[PDB]
């Protein structure tokens, strides 16, 4: 199976994301400083374990080198002060691009004012996310920071059908599309995340990714970790039951041609990389029948066996 | 995914196998008395710990009840004497259908001859397998036993690519093919296993399953356990890395619409069931988008959350 639209392949500070299935390895996006992360003692002041944070980033680099799966760090914060310090640390202690991420839009906006229109911010900071309820002050903050890449959260609790993401992105009736909104903020590269409600609905998320890649060619991915962590019946079972259940959820979108996964807490990277690399390897081996050419020699198929 | 051909759904003594993606849960097939199975004290005579064997069968039934994934037991033997006793034990100690399985055709035929004409055997025993080395003696032994279901195994190093495996199944030039051979033995129900040459080529196995379901509508599955166990680089990493890699390999065919998985030793059932149930749940949630109706309420989607 191949997509009709020519696929966007973005180069975000060296990380290739997008393409036809089997062309590029899955980009894996691990969360750091999330709510309840044990390496954060004060989520308001941003007091965190610098040694432990560095160890997670070094582990991510090592797993990436082993499998060929590139990484983007999901940097979460509950306050402007905290998220600013987290981003300053991430900039210094890895080369990877990263999501500027918060539940609260004003935390993302405040952090951007602090980080400013730094050329490094423009190259490495991906805004997470341009969502249905975006504000003009949010677009102003993105434009003033000169960001070029954003996650487009193409989710609406009233665009549940995959096909309805066309309306969300392009606009409909009197409603500006999320792509138009992003472009007004000066965004040039769009990572489309159709959103995940629960584990089962990951199949609708993946169909939405397929619609977006088929018709627009934007890189498609999703964030199933919250749904997996709300699955107490599985998580309480411990090893290896939680990990293989998680593996089934995180690999599923990749089996249908998705480009990136937000796999949740970085502490899970060791098993997530091994599962995702396995799926990537099997998909790319199908290239030998389809004629799709791998865009890089740094691919699980050439590395994990 | 929805498959072109009208799908064959077989009722093998109460186990539903086949159909469109999300119609029926994955049938899981665990191996017992395999080479080096430590509950066997004498593999030539078929002497084994019956309590340990029963404990495995009870565990399978408990896991099946939990997820709604039906089970068929893969009964392996290295001698006629041993495989005959194993089949006798399985008939009395579970209600499940089972594969009569040996790497040696002489062992399968010998064991089958010992079982004679038995309606319970005819309902529950699946011949594993009709493969490239089949003989008229073997087809005659199957017909004499009155078997109605067989695994059709297209594992051949003369048939690497999916279309070559289809040629082995459907026939080509001077060869009737494995399905035609099975029909001459009186087989009316075909569990098509294209074989797994290695881990990466599980995508080729899955493409062969797709062509089978697309064109013939026969249930399709595979046995990737041997390939995964021979993956030294991943196996060397231990738990849970080996299990999540295994889960990625075993779930991949299911994500592409496969009907059954031989997951290897039954001792791995606890994590295999959890991984496969997860995939099944996501696929069945897709049913509205595919135009499919669940054929049973005994489905992971309605059980595991």
Numbering used by the authors:
A (entry chain A), B (entry chain B): 2 to 306
Sentences from the paper on this structure:
Apart from snapshots of individual reaction steps of MtgA, structure‐based mutagenesis combined with enzymatic activity assays allowed a mechanistic description of the methyl transfer between Cbl‐CH3 and THF.
During energy production in Desulfitobacterium hafniense, MtgA catalyzes the methyl transfer from methylcobalamin (Cbl‐CH3) to THF in the catabolism of glycine betaine (GB).
